[PDB]
Amino acid sequence: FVNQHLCGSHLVEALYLVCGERGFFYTPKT
Amino acid sequence: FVNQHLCGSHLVEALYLVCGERGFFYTPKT
Amino acid sequence: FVNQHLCGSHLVEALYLVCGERGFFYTPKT
Amino acid sequence: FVNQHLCGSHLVEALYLVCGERGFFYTPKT
Amino acid sequence: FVNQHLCGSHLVEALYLVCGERGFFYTPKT
Amino acid sequence: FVNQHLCGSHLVEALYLVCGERGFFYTPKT
Amino acid sequence: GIVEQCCTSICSLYQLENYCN
Amino acid sequence: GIVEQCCTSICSLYQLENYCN
Amino acid sequence: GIVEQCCTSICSLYQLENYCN
Amino acid sequence: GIVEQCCTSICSLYQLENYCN
Amino acid sequence: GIVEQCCTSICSLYQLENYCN
Amino acid sequence: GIVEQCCTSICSLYQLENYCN
Ligand SMILES: Cc1cccc(O)c1
Ligand SMILES: Cc1cccc(O)c1
Ligand SMILES: Cc1cccc(O)c1
Ligand SMILES: Cc1cccc(O)c1
Ligand SMILES: Cc1cccc(O)c1
Ligand SMILES: Cc1cccc(O)c1
Ligand SMILES: [Cl-]
Ligand code: NA
Ligand code: NA
Ligand code: NA
Ligand SMILES: [Zn+2]
Known part of the structure; x- marks a missing residue:
């Protein structure tokens, strides 16, 4: 597997x- | 078939x- | 609805x- | 079916x- | 049908x- | 055709x- | 759920945001 | 146009619908 | 239209740009 | 190939990276 | 959260799976 | 490679087709 910014x-x-x-779950506010 | 996954x-x-x-929240089985 | 840059x-x-x-219609030149 | 919308x-x-x-111009009904 | 191309x-x-x-390498016919 | 950054x-x-x-073939390392 | 509702018929924006947190 | 309104600035739903047919 | 032509068979780039403005 | 394997059933990440260079 | 871990920094597979259900 | 040609700079259709198989 590769490690990268996403x-x-x-x-x-x-x-x-x-x-x-x-x-x-995608909770971008944190 | 993959159209549901697509x-x-x-x-x-x-x-x-x-x-x-x-x-x-993404819950494919809910 | 949310307001954001698109x-x-x-x-x-x-x-x-x-x-x-x-x-x-998407006319980016304006 | 949604494949046309997809x-x-x-x-x-x-x-x-x-x-x-x-x-x-995107015209789905034209 | 286009679902394979999609x-x-x-x-x-x-x-x-x-x-x-x-x-x-992407090889659709391989 | 248009020419643009991709x-x-x-x-x-x-x-x-x-x-x-x-x-x-997409080989970004070069 | 969202797959059952929105992969059988087209879900509008108003129907999709019912699944937001 | 749409770029200065919705990309460079922030558009509301009403503003985005100005670019529907 | 574009949906009828390009969602039945694959539309190439040359066929798609006929719908550009 | 990848179209035959992964457009009939869902290919996971582990199955997809077998096609990486 | 996920933004500071995986977007601003780089996450491993194990780190990304922390945000699976 | 393709990044310096088509991403950092601008490629023509002929240039992009250099990366087809
Ligand atoms: C960083 C990362 C982890 C797992 C899969 C990917 O495609 C990328
Ligand atoms: C800014 C904006 C308006 C309408 C829908 C969206 O997803 C985003
Ligand atoms: C730059 C470029 C070449 C060919 C097709 C495109 O959509 C864009
Ligand atoms: C946005 C979107 C994609 C696919 C199906 C839908 O109902 C809605
Ligand atoms: C680019 C594209 C997507 C879907 C169908 C087509 O004919 C072409
Ligand atoms: C990621 C992905 C898309 C479509 C089919 C698959 O098997 C996998
Ligand atoms: Cl699709
Ligand atoms: Na790996
Ligand atoms: Na809302
Ligand atoms: Na052209
Ligand atoms: Zn798709």
């Missing part, structure tokens, strides 16, 4: 991709 | 735009 | 999303 | 790239 | 994220 | 779009 749409894409059937 | 990719990108700072 | 692909995505069956 | 998302992103500065 | 659009965007700096 | 996802999108059935 922001915005690519960060949500990454979450959707990695988490799979688990789903994810 | 559909989910568009869903989370749309939620990224619509929800903005308040974020979202 | 540029490039996200601006076209937003237009496609908001305008729906109406469609839209 | 197809339109790719259409306007492609038009964004191909058309560039000259822009485009 | 699927390929998601494939190369996913490969862009997953592969990172090592890049990738 | 980086990241838009560069891969452009390659996928232009190259078609040929496919492409």
Whole structure:
């Protein structure tokens, strides 16, 4: 696997991709 | 078939735009 | 609804999303 | 079915790239 | 039908994220 | 055709779009 | 859920933001 | 146009809908 | 239109730019 | 290939990176 | 949160999976 | 490579096609 900066749409894409059937939470405010 | 998985990719990108700072939980099985 | 900056692909995505069956025009030159 | 709506998302992103500065009208019912 | 072509659009965007700096060859007929 | 800067996802999108059935190679390291 | 509702028919912006946090 | 309104500045839903057909 | 032409078969770049302004 | 494998069933990240260079 | 970890800094696979459900 | 040609600088259609297979 590669390590890189992931922001915005690519960060949500990454979450959707990695988490799979688990789903994810994207809470950018923190 | 993958169109449901493809559909989910568009869903989370749309939620990224619509929800903005308040974020979202993506739960494919819920 | 949230208010945010929308540029490039996200601006076209937003237009496609908001305008729906109406469609839209994206004229960036102005 | 949503694949036609999903197809339109790719259409306007492609038009964004191909058309560039000259822009485009997206008319789903035309 | 275009869903296979639509699927390929998601494939190369996913490969862009997953592969990172090592890049990738996209060969639809291979 | 228009000439513009193409980086990241838009560069891969452009390659996928232009190259078609040929496919492409995206080797960003060089 | 969102997959059942929005991958069968088109979900508008108003329907999608019901899934925001 | 839409760039100065919605990209450089921030647009509301009403402002974005000015660019629908 | 573009949906009828390009969501039935693959539209190349040359076919897509006919819809540019 | 990747189209045959990953457009019939969902390809995970672990399956997709086998196609990296 | 995820922004400071994965966007401003660089996250590993393990770090990104902290934001799965 | 493609980054210095097409991202940092501007490529033509002919230049982009240098990276097709
Ligand atoms: C700024 C804005 C308006 C409408 C919808 C959005 O997702 C974002
Ligand atoms: C720069 C460039 C070349 C070819 C197609 C495009 O959409 C953009
Ligand atoms: C940084 C990172 C982790 C996991 C997958 C990716 O594509 C990128
Ligand atoms: C934004 C979006 C994508 C896919 C299906 C939908 O109903 C809505
Ligand atoms: C670029 C693109 C996306 C979807 C269908 C097409 O014919 C072309
Ligand atoms: C990332 C991705 C997109 C489409 C199909 C797949 O199997 C995987
Ligand atoms: Cl799709
Ligand atoms: Na790996
Ligand atoms: Na709202
Ligand atoms: Na042209
Ligand atoms: Zn898609």
